Paper text:
[name], also named [name], is a [name] domain protein that functions in important processes involving membrane remodeling, such as mitochondrial crista ultrastructure and ciliogenesis. [name] preferentially interacts with the negatively charged phospholipids PI(4,5)P2 and cardiolipin to induce extensive membrane curvature. Furthermore, [name] is predicted to feature a [name] domain at its N-terminus and an unstructured short tail at its C-terminus. By determining the crystal structure of the [name] [name] domain, combined with atomistic molecular dynamics simulations, we uncover that [name] interacts with phosphoinositide- and cardiolipin-containing membranes to induce lipid-clustering and membrane curvature.
Thus, to elucidate the structural basis for its membrane remodeling activity, we purified and crystallized the [name] N-terminal region (residues 1–219). The crystal structure of [name] [name] domain was solved at 2.03 Å resolution. Based on the crystal structure, the region spanning residues 2–211 was coiled-coil composed of three α helices, designated as the [name] [name] domain. In the asymmetric unit of the crystals, two [name] [name] domain monomers assembled via a two-fold symmetric interface, yielding a banana-shaped homo-dimer characteristic for [name]-domain proteins. The [name] domain is finalized by a last long helix (α3) covering amino acids 142–211. In the second chain α2 helix, the loop between α2 and α3 is partially disordered from Lys125 to His142, indicating some flexibility in the structure at the distal ends. The overall dimensions of the dimeric [name] domain are 150 Å in total length and ca. 25 Å in diameter around the center of the six-helical dimer bundle. The dimer interface is extensive with a total interface area of 2532 Å2 involving 65 hydrophobic residues with >70% buried surface area at the interface and 11 hydrogen-bonded interactions across the interface. Specifically, the angle between the α2 helices of the two chains in the [name] [name] domain is 33.2°, a value that is consistent with other classical [name] domains, including N-[name] domain proteins. Consistently, the membrane interacting residues identified in our previous in vitro lipid-binding assay, including Lys107, Lys109, and Arg110 and Arg132, Arg134, and Arg136, form two positive charged clusters located on the concave surface of the [name] [name] domain dimer. Furthermore, an analysis of the electrostatic potential surface of the [name] [name] domain revealed the characteristic accumulation of positive electrostatic potential/charge on the concave surface.
Numbering used by the authors:
A (entry chain A): 7 to 125, 142 to 215
B (entry chain B): 1 to 214
Amino acid sequence: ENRNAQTKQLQTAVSNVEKHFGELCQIFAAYVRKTARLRDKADLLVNEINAYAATETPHLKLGLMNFADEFAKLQDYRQAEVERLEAKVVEPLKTYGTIVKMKRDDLKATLTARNREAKHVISQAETELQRAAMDASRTSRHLEETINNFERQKMKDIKTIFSEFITIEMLFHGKALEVYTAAYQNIQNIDED
Amino acid sequence: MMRRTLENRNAQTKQLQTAVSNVEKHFGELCQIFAAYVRKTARLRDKADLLVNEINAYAATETPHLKLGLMNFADEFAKLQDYRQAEVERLEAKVVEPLKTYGTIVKMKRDDLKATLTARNREAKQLTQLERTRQRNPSDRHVISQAETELQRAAMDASRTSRHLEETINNFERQKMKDIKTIFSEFITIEMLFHGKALEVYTAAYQNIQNIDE
């Protein structure tokens, strides 16, 4: 029905996703890197608490070492958060560079194929009319289905990717809460004798 | 006994200097690592702010329902970053700065040990010089009397100093224990508060992202 409008609609949708998913990808990747750098410093904190504990009196040494044990455990969970974020948030967003490329390549091929084939006067005009009618019908069916699928998949994927980010963070914060709730007690039960 | 007071003065001096050096080394290391931890937490907060901005920028381009859901998620995530910033500031105030104060506490302890040791060095010179004088004129009634006066005074000063050292050691250690418990209790409480707020924000954000395809 409207080739200029369907074409523009598809190019605008794929280009918008390309730009914004690509930007989300690199910021998520940076967020993951910063999370790992925080985990490095927490690891140094584990090592120093144990090194100081080693020099101290029994009750204080024990309480600090027990706290270091919990805090070290938390940093294994942080490392697992780091790895799940890269696997389930960053990598799927990076995959959209390829999806967008395939969508553009299919649009170009769609219009090139119908063009290649196209390349008395009344009979010639009738054959070209018939061909144009067939191609208009097939191309507009195809463009419509490509647009509708792209948009449905983009929504599914956005929901998945942000739902995974949120799930991964909730699980880490949930573990952190229960570790810190435990660690509080053994710092508090360091007997001042 | 004088033998015991002089021995206990020397043992307490060594005990205090060893403890002061230990606290200095390890509290100073904790100080700079906690400070680095706070900095990395702020750097993560920076990256999260940029994500807020890009989620909003992408939402601005989108269809009604999807725009609404993404901007709602960005608001929640931005509020989380305000809590992270408050975590950063409280860690600095209640964990890093109390550890940093120990550089001053340690400096004051060392200055006092140095002051005591220079006084003891001056007194020891005086005492050995007086004994050299006595050996060179041992029947001098006035040197005999100076020596008797110096014996009593040094004995009294040894007792007062070891009494001083004992209270200084006991205060430093009692305070060190109180402070380390306070500092680690604050760190845990501050994090536990952030993690609880984060869990509560994400639980809301999760439920709302799921209605995005509606």
